[PDB]
Design a binder for these strands. Structure first.
Ligand code: NA
Ligand code: NA
Length: 316
DNA sequence: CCGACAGCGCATCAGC
DNA sequence: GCTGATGCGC
DNA sequence: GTCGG
C-alpha cells in the first residue's frame, strides 16, 4: 500500500472527478484501470517513464506521476479539491440514486450537503431518499461472516417458497472475498426457461429481511436488506434468470472482470463465443450457431476444453 | 486520425 | 395515454 | 485517457 499508494490515491481521485464532474465515464475507467495495474505493480515507481511500461498507463498519466513524485502533489488536483462546486458535486454522488447528472442539478440550485438534501426531500425521488436514509450504512463493507448469515437466510426462505428454486450468491463473495459491498443473488426455477421473483421477494419481506425496495419488476429486483438483531442496512439485488441461461449467468456474475475477459479470449480460440447468457459454437466464417445446452458451470469449461477453475481462483 | 471502451433492467424524464 | 431518451446501479 | 486498427 505504501509502495505506490500516493500515486494510486491520486489516480482514484482523478477518476472520481472525471466520472462525477466531467461526466466522462471512459476517462474514469481509464484512470481506474491505471490505478489497478499500478496497485498490482510489486515495485516502488521512481518515474513516469517506468510506469508507462505498464498497460493502461500512457503519456498523460506518466506526466502526472512525474509531477507527483517531484512535488508530492498535483496542481490540477489541488484546484479541484479547493473547488466548492466540484467537491460538492463529487460528494453528492456518494448518495445511492444520485449520479453525476442529479448531483449537478442539485448543486446548481444551491443543494450541496446531506443537510441540504434533508431540507429538500420533495426534490428527491424514492431511490435517492433511500440512499440518503442509509448513507452511512451503504458506505460500509460487509464482512464475510455477515454475508454468510445473509446467505443462510436467502437460501432458507427461497427454499420455503418452492423447493425447486435454485439460488446462488455471486460476486466477490463467491470468489471467497473477506468482505463485499453488496449481495448479488442469482435465482432460477425449472419452470422458467427461454411471477417467480415477486414470490421470493415477498417472503424475504415477510420475515423482515428485505426492508426497502429500490426497483422491482419481472426479472431484476434491487432493494435494501438487514440482518436481525442493530446491523447496518445492506444493498441487495436478486436476478431471475432462465434455467438454460443460469450457469452462464452464475459464471458471468461471479467474475472477476479480468477473469471473464480472459475466458472469452480463450473461448474464441477454441471456436466458441461466451457472453452473459449463452455459449455458442462459431462457424468457419464466424457465424454463431445455436446456444449450447448448459446444465452446470463445469459444462462451460468443458466446451472450451479448459480446466475447471474454482471461484476462489478467478481473480485473474 | 479516430472509434472502442459492457451494457442490461428498471425508474424517471422529455416529447407527442 | 403512449413511445423513446436519459439516468442510475451494477 | 489509453489502446489499437
Ligand atoms: Na503503457
Ligand atoms: Na450515487
Amino acid at each position: 500500500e505504501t509502495l505506490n499508494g500516493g500515486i494510486t490515491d491520486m489516480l482514484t481521485e482523478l477518476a472520481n472527478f472525471e466520472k462525477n464532474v466531467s461526466q466522462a465515464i471512459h476517462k474514469y475507467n481509464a484512470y481506474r484501470k491505471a490505478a489497478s495495474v499500478i496497485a498490482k505493480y510489486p515495485h516502488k515507481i521512481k518515474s513516469g517513464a517506468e510506469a508507462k511500461k505498464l498497460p493502461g498507463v500512457g503519456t498523460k498519466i506518466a506526466e502526472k506521476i512525474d509531477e507527483f513524485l517531484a512535488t508530492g502533489k498535483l496542481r490540477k488536483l489541488e484546484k479541484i479539491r479547493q473547488d466548492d462546486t466540484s467537491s460538492s458535486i463529487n460528494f453528492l454522488t456518494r448518495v445511492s440514486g444520485i449520479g453525476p447528472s442529479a448531483a449537478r442539478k442539485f448543486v446548481d440550485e444551491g443543494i450541496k450537503t446531506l443537510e441540504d438534501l434533508r431540507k429538500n426531500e420533495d426534490k428527491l425521488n424514492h431511490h435517492q431518499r433511500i440512499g440518503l436514509k442509509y448513507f452511512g450504512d451503504f458506505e460500509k463493507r460487509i464482512p464475510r461472516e455477515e454475508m454468510l448469515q445473509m446467505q443462510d437466510i436467502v437460501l432458507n426462505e427461497v427454499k420455503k417458497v418452492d423447493s425447486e428454486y435454485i439460488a446462488t450468491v455471486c460476486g466477490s463473495f463467491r470468489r471467497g472475498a473477506e468482505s463485499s459491498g453488496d449481495m448479488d443473488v442469482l435465482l432460477t426455477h425449472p419452470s422458467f426457461t427461454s411471477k417467480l421473483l415477486h414470490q421470493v421477494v415477498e417472503q424475504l419481506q415477510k420475515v423482515h429481511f428485505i426492508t426497502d425496495t429500490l426497483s422491482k419488476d419481472e426479472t431484476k429486483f434491487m432493494g435494501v436488506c438487514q440482518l436481525p438483531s442493530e446491523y447496518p442496512h445492506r444493498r441487495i439485488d436478486i436476478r431471475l434468470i432462465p434455467k438454460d441461461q443460469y450457469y452462464c449467468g452464475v459464471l458471468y456474475f461471479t467474475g472477476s472482470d479480468i477473469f471473464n475477459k480472459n475466458m472469452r479470449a480463450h473461448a474464441l480460440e477454441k471456436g466458441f463465443t461466451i457472453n452473459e447468457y449463452t455459449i455458442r459454437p462459431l462457424g468457419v466464417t464466424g457465424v454463431a450457431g445455436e446456444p449450447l445446452p448448459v446444465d452446470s458451470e463445469k459444462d462451460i469449461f468443458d466446451y472450451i476444453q479448459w480446466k475447471y477453475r474454482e471461484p476462489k481462483d478467478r481473480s485473474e
